[PDB]
Design a protein around this ligand. Sequence first.
Ligand SMILES: CCCCCCCCCCCCCCCCCC(=O)OC[C@H](COP(=O)([O-])OCC(O)COP(=O)([O-])OC[C@@H](COC(=O)CCCCCCCCCCCCCCCCC)OC(=O)CCCCCCCCCCCCCCCCC)OC(=O)CCCCCCCCCCCCCCCCC
Ligand SMILES: CCCCCCCCCCCCCCCCCC(=O)OC[C@H](COP(=O)([O-])OCC(O)COP(=O)([O-])OC[C@@H](COC(=O)CCCCCCCCCCCCCCCCC)OC(=O)CCCCCCCCCCCCCCCCC)OC(=O)CCCCCCCCCCCCCCCCC
Ligand SMILES: CCCCCCCCCCCCCCCCCC(=O)OC[C@H](COP(=O)([O-])OCC(O)COP(=O)([O-])OC[C@@H](COC(=O)CCCCCCCCCCCCCCCCC)OC(=O)CCCCCCCCCCCCCCCCC)OC(=O)CCCCCCCCCCCCCCCCC
Ligand SMILES: CCCCCCCCCCCCCCCCCC(=O)OC[C@H](COP(=O)([O-])OCC[N+](C)(C)C)OC(=O)CCCCCCCCCCCCCCCCC
Ligand SMILES: CCCCCCCCCCCCCCCCCC(=O)OC[C@H](COP(=O)([O-])OCC[N+](C)(C)C)OC(=O)CCCCCCCCCCCCCCCCC
Ligand SMILES: NC(=O)c1ccc[n+]([C@@H]2O[C@H](COP(=O)([O-])OP(=O)(O)OC[C@H]3O[C@@H](n4cnc5c(N)ncnc54)[C@H](O)[C@@H]3O)[C@@H](O)[C@H]2O)c1
Ligand SMILES: Nc1ncnc2c1ncn2[C@@H]1O[C@H](COP(=O)(O)OP(=O)(O)OP(=O)(O)O)[C@@H](O)[C@H]1O
Ligand SMILES: [Mg+2]
Lengths: 256, 120, 54, 70, 283
Amino acid sequence: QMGFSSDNPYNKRWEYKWKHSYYTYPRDYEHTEVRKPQDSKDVPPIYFAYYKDFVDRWLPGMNMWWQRRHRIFDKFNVYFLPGMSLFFYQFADLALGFKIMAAFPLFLAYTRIRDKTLDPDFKETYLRDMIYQNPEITKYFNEETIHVLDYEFEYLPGYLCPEKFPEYQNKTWQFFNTDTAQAEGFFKFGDVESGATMTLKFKTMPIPGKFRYQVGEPFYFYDLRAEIKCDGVYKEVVLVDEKESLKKIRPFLFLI
Amino acid sequence: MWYKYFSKQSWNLRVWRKANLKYNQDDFGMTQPKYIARFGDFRFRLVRTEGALRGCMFFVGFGCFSIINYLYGRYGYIINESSQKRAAQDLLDNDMAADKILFKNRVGAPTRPLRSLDDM
Amino acid sequence: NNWHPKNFNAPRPSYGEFTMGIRCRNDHHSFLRYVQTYRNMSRHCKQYFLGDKQ
Amino acid sequence: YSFVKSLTHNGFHMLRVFRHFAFVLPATVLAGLGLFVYWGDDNKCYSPDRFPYLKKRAGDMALPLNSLNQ
Amino acid sequence: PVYANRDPETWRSAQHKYSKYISNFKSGDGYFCIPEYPYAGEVECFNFFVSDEVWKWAQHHGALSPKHTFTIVNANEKFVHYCDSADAFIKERLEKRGIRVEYNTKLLEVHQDGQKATFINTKTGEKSVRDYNNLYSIVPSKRQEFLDKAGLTNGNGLLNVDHQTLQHKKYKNIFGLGDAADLPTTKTFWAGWYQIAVVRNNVKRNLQGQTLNAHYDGFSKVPLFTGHQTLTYVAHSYGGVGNWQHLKHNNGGILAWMRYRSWAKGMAKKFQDFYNGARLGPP
Ligand SMILES: CCCCCCCCCCCCCCCCCC(=O)OC[C@H](COP(=O)([O-])OCC(O)COP(=O)([O-])OC[C@@H](COC(=O)CCCCCCCCCCCCCCCCC)OC(=O)CCCCCCCCCCCCCCCCC)OC(=O)CCCCCCCCCCCCCCCCC
Ligand SMILES: CCCCCCCCCCCCCCCCCC(=O)OC[C@H](COP(=O)([O-])OCC(O)COP(=O)([O-])OC[C@@H](COC(=O)CCCCCCCCCCCCCCCCC)OC(=O)CCCCCCCCCCCCCCCCC)OC(=O)CCCCCCCCCCCCCCCCC
Ligand SMILES: CCCCCCCCCCCCCCCCCC(=O)OC[C@H](COP(=O)([O-])OCC(O)COP(=O)([O-])OC[C@@H](COC(=O)CCCCCCCCCCCCCCCCC)OC(=O)CCCCCCCCCCCCCCCCC)OC(=O)CCCCCCCCCCCCCCCCC
Ligand SMILES: CCCCCCCCCCCCCCCCCC(=O)OC[C@H](COP(=O)([O-])OCC[N+](C)(C)C)OC(=O)CCCCCCCCCCCCCCCCC
Ligand SMILES: CCCCCCCCCCCCCCCCCC(=O)OC[C@H](COP(=O)([O-])OCC[N+](C)(C)C)OC(=O)CCCCCCCCCCCCCCCCC
Ligand SMILES: NC(=O)c1ccc[n+]([C@@H]2O[C@H](COP(=O)([O-])OP(=O)(O)OC[C@H]3O[C@@H](n4cnc5c(N)ncnc54)[C@H](O)[C@@H]3O)[C@@H](O)[C@H]2O)c1
Ligand SMILES: Nc1ncnc2c1ncn2[C@@H]1O[C@H](COP(=O)(O)OP(=O)(O)OP(=O)(O)O)[C@@H](O)[C@H]1O
Ligand SMILES: [Mg+2]
């Protein structure tokens, strides 16, 4: 689910990505059809630009934090960081260094909340490069004739099954993380040239790569499946199988 | 067909949280030495990068330096009050020793400090 | 040449292995923004045409 | 362009090294509304407590600078 | 993820893959393979104690997956052949740490495609195929055939010389030292410090026809890294008896930490003088 969503009807999966050069916001939301001059309100009311920024930038940003509020309720953000800030706040009048040591855990908490509440964004150009290399998909789909019917991608709540992923039964990791940082979704595609449709289901997880501490890829498709439907032919293509992928690589277990 | 007009030459970086993931931190930076101990390993494990760690220690350092400057202001005589009383009487003992052996002219000025080695 | 005037701070390449972080505003969203801007400018202007087909 | 909107680096402005000058011209224009309301010395203070008021009441005549005290 | 004991000569100065054996062990099956004795670098290349301490840290904060396997595949029956005091200490410490060991098994083939490692139990002649994700193997040695065609080696393929004077049994004008010599001691470098003093002496005596008064007592000293920043010294005579340094400060501490820094930070700069001639052996 897209966390940043306004009353604008068009391009829901691009609303957070597109950076408009508008000085202020348009008078009306993008019209879905030709309207009458009396449908819209001439000379919008006073303080309209301030109202639009609150309902198109502020409010959907808070709805994003509220939608994914379960990813920030860890003992580190809830107890440790505010508890540390209160310890130094009692000596805020003694010196300046206590004010900084009492505000830093607050800024650190905001940064963890800011990054964890964003929409999960995978490298989509890697994905389309992967499906266009498969011969069974390029038989019915092409970049010049494909269109998106539905898109869904959201983090998975809580810790997963403690047999498929024993990594998350770590008390040190659970102190900082309440979720698994893995995401799951699908892609409803259609081809206007061949008339075929497919549901591209995928599961992602962060993996380590080539280095000791840095994550290699935060959204690695460890399961990638395509249920292609045609006129009278139903094909099932398996690009990445999880039984073969989970034996080679394991999740990353973000901290902080 | 936006991907048709996508330029793959932007794949030179993998930007995520304002950090390039294809950064050889095993050969450059504070994370290059592999002889780091348990504390330094767990510290780099939390931040995953040296650029983020150094940025936070920049502000925590100002707080720690300003705090220890206060504790040495309020406190300090617990450890340094003896070396001040020692130098207090020492500052008076050599002053009195100077008046005993020093040439004073008709006005109270030691105009011959280089008369002998003990005078200097 | 009115497309790339010569200045001192010229564009220079970046290397993955050697780059820690970067602050860049360029993306690949201009094509779809070009299509939507046309649909918006076309439709929002026809609101005040009163159905004049010509 | 707003100084506030450029702080998040998510709308139209990534690097703006002079963003702290964005509201100087608007604030200067809004201050121009009182250009004529506050014109001269008398409109910026209580003039009877200032020296020039005394010279006017004396027939536009020069007075010693300590006339407000005696 | 296949690592070895020495670097290939095709690597440039910017290749540091050797140092990623312990770092890049996020998960999978890990194997430390010891070839069939005689092999070069018996104790000086035993890094399963430093990796265990670092991999213990990785299991604490989740860097190393909880389902990982590490075992020591030893082709021989014992780790230190000519010093049973140190060999008993290693197996005693490996059990205390929790490391699993498989004896009489040697690495035979490495499949780079599917990361398959072919092991064979030389005791029963039974081979198996195992998936690996982090493979370390000490490079195996090979007896040179010309030393057998000339009738100088015996049995395993080492030089058959006197244990005292380092002179060959026959052909008294021929000597031998280092690793090629068959001496009941650990083939270390400090052992070679006391073998060159005997060779340069006895050779000097045969050039003048005099007798051989230089005897080699079988001394050999090699550090055994017991931790990430601590070590103990494996020093022993010909009869496997150790000196005052043998297996001392073996459980870590300040004494073990100081001796580690002297060998890690202050020993590589000494091999420049060894080759030039500025600094001689220990005595
Ligand atoms: C006259 C008119 C005007 C009046 C104005 C004044 C009135 C204002 C009223 C304000 C109060 C109402 C607002 C909040 C209502 C929320 C009620 C609610 O039900 O929410 C539950 C709701 C749970 O939703 P859910 O998913 O449906 O729940 C499902 C399950 O139950 C989930 O299960 P779970 O197991 O996952 O549990 C999740 C839950 C877990 O909840 C908990 O377990 C409670 C933990 C609270 C910890 C607070 C103390 C932290 C330190 C303790 C350390 C102790 C150990 C160390 C001791 C060392 C001592 C030095 O997480 C939380 O909700 C906690 C979120 C953060 C709270 C802590 C914020 C710390 C602020 C510190 C400063 C406090 C200043 C107070 C003012 C006093 C001075 C003026 O959570 C939220 O909605 C979160 C809302 C957003 C967070 C609000 C917190 C304040 C944020 C503002 C930032 C600035 C703070 C102040 C700084 C000022 C100085 C700089
Ligand atoms: C003294 C006056 C105090 C006045 C008040 C001050 C205020 C005190 C309150 C606040 C405390 C300070 C807060 C600092 C933290 C601030 C936050 C921060 O910056 O980040 C953490 C920050 C991290 O530091 P770092 O730079 O990242 O560490 C370096 C590497 O990154 C780390 O790399 P690594 O982790 O990979 O490996 C580390 C290490 C491996 O380290 C370890 O693994 C050891 C860990 C063992 C842990 C054991 C845990 C045991 C648990 C407790 C015991 C168990 C229970 C016992 C039960 C008993 C029952 C009763 O490996 C090494 O090879 C070490 C290098 C060689 C040693 C260098 C030592 C220099 C000492 C020079 C002074 C010598 C004086 C000797 C005198 C002795 C007698 C007094 O921690 C510190 O800053 C520590 C404070 C250092 C301050 C330096 C400025 C002062 C210079 C030293 C004093 C010189 C003498 C002055 C007096 C001379 C006349 C007497
Ligand atoms: C009860 C009644 C009913 C209540 C309910 C109904 C009411 C609900 C709300 C209704 C609407 C309210 C409007 C605001 C909310 C709108 C929400 C929104 O999204 O808007 C976004 C909206 C969208 O942007 P836009 O439409 O494109 O353009 C907006 C503007 O055209 C221009 O945009 P801009 O971004 O270009 O403007 C920038 C400007 C905006 O103007 C300001 O906000 C003035 C800021 C001046 C204060 C800066 C403080 C700095 C930090 C101080 C920290 C300590 C503070 C202690 C204070 C103690 C006080 C004695 O700020 C600056 O110029 C920043 C640079 C300042 C120069 C450098 C100063 C810092 C360096 C010097 C440091 C010196 C100390 C160093 C050492 C320190 C010791 C360590 O942007 C806005 O922010 C709108 C605000 C415009 C003013 C509205 C006023 C309406 C009239 C209401 C009465 C006045 C209320 C405000 C008074 C504030 C106190 C002065
Ligand atoms: C302790 C008591 C409360 C303390 C006072 C708290 C005051 C908080 C509000 C003032 C500070 C706001 C910062 C202004 C600068 C950033 C502007 C901004 O928010 O952009 C949104 C940004 C918008 O994202 P953006 O700026 O990156 O751009 C979006 C991207 N495009 C343009 C492409 C669409 O979103 C966020 O930053 C995340 C949400 C932040 C939430 C802001 C604070 C909300 C606090 C709610 C308090 C409710 C209770 C109080 C009121 C109750 C009723 C009386
Ligand atoms: C009594 C006074 C002290 C009050 C407490 C300290 C508050 C900080 C001091 C007040 C500053 C107000 C003036 C400046 C306003 C900000 C200006 C600015 O640049 O902001 C833009 C920023 C934009 O940040 P950004 O990350 O989105 O984008 C910036 C990216 N760069 C840096 C590259 C440009 O938005 C902010 O508001 C950041 C400041 C947030 C401070 C919030 C402190 C509290 C954190 C939440 C509470 C957490 C409690 C625990 C939660 C538990 C889990 C739910
Ligand atoms: N861990 C290892 O793999 C390893 C390898 C070599 C040396 N070392 C250490 O160094 C110590 C002494 O090393 P070393 O000198 O006994 O072995 P060495 O391999 O280092 O020396 C052999 C020298 O003879 C040469 N050589 C081999 N075959 C030759 C042939 N047919 N013809 C001419 N030259 C030939 C080699 O080029 C080499 O210069 C060892 O005790 C050990 O501690 C370790
Ligand atoms: N090669 C690059 N060089 C410079 N800046 C970059 C580069 N790649 C990304 N950036 C910046 O980092 C941001 C994030 O890049 P990112 O790949 O996540 O965007 P994206 O729209 O999600 O791509 P995709 O559609 O493939 O998922 C970008 O908006 C850009 O500003
Ligand atoms: Mg993306």
